[PDB]
Structures are given as structure tokens and as C-alpha cells.
Design a binder for this molecule. Structure first.
Ligand SMILES: Cn1cc(NS(=O)(=O)N2CCC[C@H](C(N)=O)C2)cn1
Ligand SMILES: [Zn+2]
Length: 139
């Protein structure tokens, strides 16, 4: 679990969104596994605006942060799960590292701020849903 809080927005994995998230829906994209809902309180997270390919992510299944190199956002095949059939997930970045499903929502951060959140995993790789292109999160 986990979310990004920036301005009056909350960014979560779409497959973990709550009833309140859907009742205050701002934007959602099944192909990216993202959902953004509105909040009443102000968010203070800083979103990175860059092309970094190195950062640190939080892994709840190890209670640890790991430094990683990660690929540029791209269209990646994701095998079927209880939340989606087998499909291409867009704007996904991969790194060599550990993750389990409950790790979804952990933040990946570079020197510039929040890059994205844990979204996929398996075969010793971890995938992060990029949020650097969502320029509207800051206005
Ligand atoms: C973070 N993580 C996720 C998994 N398992 S998964 O890749 O099957 N995952 C299950 C939950 C939905 C995910 C998606 N974005 O389609 C895929 C293992 N580690
Ligand atoms: Zn960066």
C-alpha cells in the first residue's frame, strides 16, 4: 500500500483505490494502473520533472529502501492477476529488485523528487508506474 500526496491530489495504484478514491475521482487510467483522487488537505510531496534512470524505492516486504537503476517509461506486457487480465501496461519502468504485491504503492524517488510508485513485480524485477509526465499534478 501507499500513495503520493501533492497539492489537492492523492495518487494511488488504481487496483488498490478505495470507495472514497472513486467517489472523489479526478483521473484514472487502467493501462497505467494509476488513479488520482481529490483531497481536502494540502499535499507536500515534490514530483520529479526529469529523465533520471537511478533512484531509491521503499520495499515494505523488507522494511528497507533500495537504490536501483530503472528503465525509461515504456509499454510492457503484464501477466494476468486477480485485478487485471494479461495486458500491456504503459508508462512502466523496470529495475532488478525484490517486490511482492503488497509492496504496491511504495515510492520511487530520485534527486529531483517523486518519480513513481511500485506497480508490478516477478522474476526478480520490480516495475514502477511513472508520474513525471503528469504535469497537471502541480496545478
Ligand atoms: C509489486 N508487485 C506486484 C506483483 N505482482 S503482479 O505483478 O502480478 N501485480 C499484481 C497486482 C496488479 C499489478 C498490475 N499493475 O497489473 C501486477 C509483485 N510485486
Ligand atoms: Zn530525477
Amino acid at each position: 500500500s501507499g500513495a503520493i500526496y501533492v497539492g489537492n491530489y492523492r495518487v494511488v495504484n488504481r487496483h488498490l483505490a478505495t470507495h472514497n478514491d472513486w467517489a472523489n475521482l479526478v483521473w484514472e487510467d487502467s493501462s497505467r494502473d494509476l488513479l488520482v483522487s481529490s483531497t481536502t488537505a494540502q499535499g507536500c510531496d515534490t514530483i520529479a520533472r526529469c529523465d533520471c534512470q537511478t533512484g531509491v524505492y521503499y520495499c515494505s516486504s523488507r522494511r528497507k529502501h533500495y537504490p536501483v537503476s530503472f528503465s525509461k517509461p515504456s509499454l510492457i506486457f503484464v501477466e494476468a492477476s486477480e485485478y487485471y487480465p494479461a495486458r500491456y501496461q504503459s508508462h512502466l519502468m523496470l529495475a532488478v529488485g525484490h517486490s511482492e504485491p503488497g509492496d504496491c504503492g511504495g515510492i520511487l524517488r530520485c534527486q529531483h523528487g517523486v518519480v513513481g510508485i511500485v506497480s508490478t513485480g516477478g522474476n526478480g524485477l520490480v516495475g514502477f508506474a511513472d508520474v513525471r509526465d503528469l504535469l497537471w499534478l502541480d496545478e
